[PDB]
Write a protein that binds this ligand. Structure first.
Ligand SMILES: Cn1c(Nc2ccc(C(F)(F)F)cc2)nc2cc(Oc3ccnc(-c4ncc(C(F)(F)F)[nH]4)c3)ccc21
Length: 257
């Protein structure tokens, strides 16, 4: 079992604060991170989502997936994971503008792909893969998490952005978010930088009038990688490759550098 007996977790510095969640740096057999719920009495829907998150996390045991460590019900609903040292891929690329060498960029892609393939094998759809959810641990290991606390439309596949079905979320949807993550790694930028209207980005991506400008890729970006990016970003979801095949392509281009 993974229930941490109450009076063990020492919640400390509030690192992130959101609408429902609040992440704290903590202490439980060393430094840990604690996702918590603000309320003293939780909603039956809140208790379900906590049960679901812990449910997903207890199915994961992989280096590219954030280490689930335990849960706690009393006093507040809390999910304990490892504490990570460093910053998210988003922070690196877009906040502090870290200039990674092409070889590292491809490795960050390979690691994200590795973690993605694991989740998909375990029939887990992330639904929200983005650079803010890729943690570059000890500055070298990708750790896929859910560092969000609330949409994030830049990584959404046209079929998702359209909401033309009850569940438009697929393994393919995640492949498109991965495609956008590759665009970030290879351009050092977010897509649709020149468009200042969210609703229009939404409208156009859905209608397929707008796609990421692949000409923005770094000069040293391998032709194979740019091709892979293009496949991951296909408007038609059936045309998108899956992570076993994505991994294969990344690992191959990595060898030719
Ligand atoms: C419960 N829960 C999850 N859920 C999750 C669900 C599914 C999956 C998957 F299965 F789909 F993979 C993966 C994760 N993700 C989390 C992320 C959390 O934040 C953390 C964790 C570790 N370190 C930090 C940090 N270190 C330095 C800094 C900074 F930013 F302050 F510098 N922040 C921050 C806390 C709790 C988290």
């Amino acid at each position: 079992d993974w229930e941490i007996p109450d009076g063990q977790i020492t919640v400390g510095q509030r690192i992130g604060s959101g609408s429902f969640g609040t992440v704290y740096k903590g202490k439980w057999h060393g430094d840990v991170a604690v996702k918590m719920l603000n309320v003293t009495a939780p909603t039956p829907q809140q208790l379900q989502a906590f049960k679901n998150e812990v449910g997903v996390l207890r199915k994961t045991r992989h280096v590219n997936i954030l280490l689930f460590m335990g849960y706690s019900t009393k006093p507040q609903l809390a999910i304990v994971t490892q504490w990570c040292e460093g910053s998210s891929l988003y922070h690196h690329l877009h906040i502090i503008e870290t200039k990674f060498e092409m070889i590292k960029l491809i490795d960050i892609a390979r690691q994200t792909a590795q973690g993605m393939d694991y989740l998909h094998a375990k029939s887990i759809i992330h639904r929200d893969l983005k650079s803010n959810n890729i943690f570059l641990h000890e500055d070298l290991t990708v750790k896929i998490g859910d560092f969000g606390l609330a949409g994030s439309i830049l990584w959404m596949a046209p079929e998702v952005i359209r909401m033309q079905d009850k569940n438009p979320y697929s393994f393919q949807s995640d492949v498109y978010a991965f495609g956008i993550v590759l665009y970030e790694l290879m351009t050092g930028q977010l897509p649709y930088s020149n468009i200042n209207n969210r609703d229009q980005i939404i409208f156009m991506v859905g209608r397929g009038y707008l796609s990421p400008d692949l000409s923005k890729v770094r000069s040293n970006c391998p032709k194979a990688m740019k091709r892979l990016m293009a496949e991951c970003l296909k408007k038609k979801r059936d045309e998108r490759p899956l992570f076993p095949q994505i991994l294969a392509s990344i690992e191959l281009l990595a060898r030719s550098l």
